[PDB]
């Protein structure tokens, strides 16, 4: 066989043996669950 020996590094296809060194740039943020359950009501005034 060829014995590929893939290295570290995520966020890319299998064609890349290594992408990052000690700190890869790829980062993922959480989906911020229940974001629709927040209304964000504005403020209003009273009759002067």
């Amino acid at each position: 066989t060829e014995q590929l020996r893939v290295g570290p590094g995520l966020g890319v296809g299998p064609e890349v043996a290594a992408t990052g060194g000690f700190h890869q740039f790829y980062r993922q943020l959480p989906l911020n669950i229940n974001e629709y359950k927040l209304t964000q009501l504005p403020g209003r005034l009273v009759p002067g």
């Binding site: 669950i33 927040l38 964000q40």
Partner: protein
């Protein structure tokens, strides 16, 4: 020789500091500013003044803008030195700020105590104590005028002065609640002090008088101010015991971009008591001697930096069930957070967690917007209350995870959040942008 011998020692590494210079430190150009004047004007207080009463005042239109507000109180000691603890602060139970008929903010005596304990420091903190307590060993009957500066955003920087001038159709009011009792003034622990004087109260507002063009601009142009607000809810503490480490998940009903959270545990009976009582100097009434009783604090020394008497073992904040940061010990929140973010010293039992680089400043420096967080939770772990508080050795020589048996008296939990909002003022009216 002399200073010239240093100037000659010039090379490549100096270019980064002094090449193509932009400034000089030896010539300062001061900025020309507008013409203004400041006047201290007394406000009229409606409603009977006395302990436990609710009174109010409307801020007069003497100037164009307002900044500092200081509340004066006159109290007489109901007992000897060592019997009071920040009594003027205790007395001003709360204050509401209403602009245009809308609540803008609200502070509580405990916030003033927490705020001071956490954000003031050094000589400013001492001068503050001098204006709210008796600190020169005064005796029973001593009369003193106290000053309790308010800490609303417009009372912290002139930059956020309220433009009464731009609020032509809107009133600005302060509502004050006076405590039913003040320790060492009209009550001693649970007992009333017969004959105690009722407070004399007066509210002072420092007004800014602007010159012709600046006044014109304020009156006619729209303004928006980025201001601070305090969010606050009182909770029941998952009180620890000699037999267990209590823990508690507290869902935080907070909103808005938050600079920081602050909290404390306390004995609701004894104002400002954030720590357990013990027979060690200052930790209880009579501490260190035969009369030491670990049921009542040495009121004049109620606060302490002695962590052993604190009850928080560890804590974390979770957002939507996910850890915000790794769990840290109570001393992290008490000593490290303030070191990093404030630079002062925080008393045991008072905790801070900042979402901001510099939460003590006016300028936002990173916030946690809870208006976009479904479930914000503060997770607390408490210390084990197994130490016999009447035995100094038991207290002073013990381990990290334990505290005094008297620490179970700290059953009240106060959680605060300091956030930003926007005060929009225009066309004679104003209020806050967000709810």
């Amino acid at each position: 020789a002399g200073g010239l011998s240093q100037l000659v020692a010039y090379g490549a590494q100096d270019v980064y500091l002094t090449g193509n210079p932009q400034i000089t430190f030896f010539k300062t150009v001061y900025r020309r500013y507008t013409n203004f004047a400041i006047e201290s004007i007394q406000q009229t207080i409606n409603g009977s003044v006395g302990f436990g009463n609710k009174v109010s005042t409307q801020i007069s239109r003497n100037g164009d803008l307002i900044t500092d507000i200081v509340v004066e109180f006159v109290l007489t000691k109901g007992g000897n030195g060592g019997t009071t603890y920040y009594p003027a602060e205790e007395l001003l139970q709360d204050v509401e700020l209403e602009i245009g008929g809308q609540r803008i903010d609200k502070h509580y005596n405990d916030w003033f105590r927490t705020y001071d304990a956490l954000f003031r420091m050094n000589d400013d903190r001492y001068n503050y104590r001098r204006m709210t307590d008796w600190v020169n060993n005064e005796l029973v009957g001593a009369q003193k005028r106290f000053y309790v500066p308010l800490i609303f955003f417009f009372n912290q920087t002139p930059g956020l002065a309220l433009p009464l001038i731009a609020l032509q159709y809107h009133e600005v009011k302060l509502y004050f609640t006076l405590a039913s009792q003040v320790q060492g003034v009209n009550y001693n622990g649970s007992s009333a002090i017969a004959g105690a004087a009722q407070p004399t109260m007066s509210v002072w507002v420092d007004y800014i008088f602007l010159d012709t063009q600046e006044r014109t601009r304020f009156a006619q142009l729209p303004h928006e101010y980025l201001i601070e607000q305090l969010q606050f809810t009182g909770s029941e503490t998952a009180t620890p015991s000699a037999t267990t480490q209590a823990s508690q998940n507290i869902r935080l009903n907070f909103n808005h971009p938050t600079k920081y959270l602050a909290w404390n545990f306390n004995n609701p009976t004894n104002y400002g008591q954030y720590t357990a009582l013990a027979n060690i100097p200052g930790a209880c009434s009579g501490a260190g001697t035969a009369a030491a009783t670990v049921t009542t604090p040495d009121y004049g020394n109620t606060g302490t930096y002695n962590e052993q008497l604190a009850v928080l073992d560890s804590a974390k904040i979770q957002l939507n069930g996910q850890d915000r940061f790794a769990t840290r010990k109570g001393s992290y929140f008490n000593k490290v957070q303030p070191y990093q973010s404030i630079g002062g010293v925080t008393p045991a039992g008072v905790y801070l967690y900042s979402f901001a680089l510099k939460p003590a400043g006016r300028q936002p420096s990173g916030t946690c917007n809870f208006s976009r967080i479904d479930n914000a939770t503060l997770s607390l772990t408490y210390k084990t209350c197994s130490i016999d508080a009447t035995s100094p050795a038991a207290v002073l020589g013990n381990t990290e995870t334990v505290t005094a048996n008297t620490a179970t008296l700290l059953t009240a939990l106060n959680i605060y959040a300091k956030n930003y909002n926007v005060l929009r003022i225009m066309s004679g009216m104003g209020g806050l942008a967000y709810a």
